[PDB]
Structure formats: C-alpha cells, structure tokens
Amino acid sequence: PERKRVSKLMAYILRHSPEEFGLRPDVEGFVSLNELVNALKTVYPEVTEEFVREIVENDPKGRYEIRGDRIRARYGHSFPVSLDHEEDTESRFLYHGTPRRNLPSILKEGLKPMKRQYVHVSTDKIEALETGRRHGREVVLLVIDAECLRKRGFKIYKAGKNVRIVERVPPDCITLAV
Asked: Mind telling me which InterPro entries this protein's record contains?
C-alpha cells in the first residue's frame, strides 16, 4: 500500500464529496474513523486504521485531524463545515430559499436534516434565495426566528461567512414564507 495515493483519496473524500461514500459528516466535519477506513478499503483494500493514523500524523500541511474515533479535514471543504464549533448568538433572523413545491410540506413539518445530520440556512437573503434557486424555480424565502431556534434548544453554528447550520427548524420558528 502507498501513502500518497491514499492521502489524496482521503483529501477528496473528507473535503468535497463525503456523501458519495455513504459518510454523513457532522457540524464540525468529522466522520467515524472506522467508517472512513471502510470507505477507503473499497478502493485500496490494503488500507488499515493504523495506516490512516500514520498519514494523519505525518502529513506535512496538516490536512487532517483526529478526535478520538472521529476524523476530519482541516481546510479545503467544498461543503459548509463549522470548524472550531463556533456558535452564533448575535443573530435574530435567518433565511432559507426553497422551491414552492415543498412549501406546504415545510410549513407543516419544518426543515428536517434528511441526507445530512444538519440543515443549512443563511444570515443573508441573497444567499438563501440563490441557494434555493439552484434547487429549481418557484423559489420562496422562509424567514426564521433565530431566538426561537435557540430557546427551543437548537444552537446555530457558523459554517461560512454568512452560512449557518442547525439540526432542525421547527414550523414554530418559521415566521414568514414570502
């Protein structure tokens, strides 16, 4: 087994497309180390967990980080990740763009995590509207009360500049669907 090719595959998996290997990353970007070893074995069978730990320890640019049984990339992500687990308290309203077909379903049951464990929202209207415009047309803007989410037991985390991620958005926190 060669280290460099496995390291490039690790970077590709943990940075850009982890969903392609059946890997649901958390809010910080970590995945199960055993699950990552299982995913890496599907391409390089000669890969073990000790080899992955060696790659993480001897990486010259510090691309990887391991906490207990979880492993993540430290930078270069193509999808929103909340490094440092930095939480957002100074926000009173968040925004989310969604197609009109899902409008009654959302208004009835709120935003659900579905594929990933979390849900992406934005502190900006333009960003939410364009993100929803990528998932089809007839896009409406859901305004979300942030203090509702916090008082209902959901902490808002900073993933990008104007990107936030929560676990769920109950229908009670959706204040308006323009």
From this structure: Ptrans_KptA/Tpt1, RNA_2'-PTrans_C, RNA_2'-PTrans_KptA, RNA_2'-PTrans_N
7 and 63 fall within a common domain: yes
Tally the domains of the chain: 2
Assess whether 35 and 70 both reside in one domain: yes
State the method.
Answer: X-ray
- Can you give the three-state secondary structure of the chain, one letter per residue? CCHHHHHHHHHHHHHCCCHHHCCCCCCCCCEEHHHHHHHHHCCCCCCCHHHHHHHHHCCCCCCEEEECCEEEECCCCCCCCCHHHCEECCCCEEEEEEEHHHHHHHHHHCECCCCCCCEEEECCHHHHHHHHHCCCCCEEEEEEEHHHHHHCCCCEEECCCCEEEECCECHHHEEEEC
Q: Is residue 83 part of a domain?
A: no
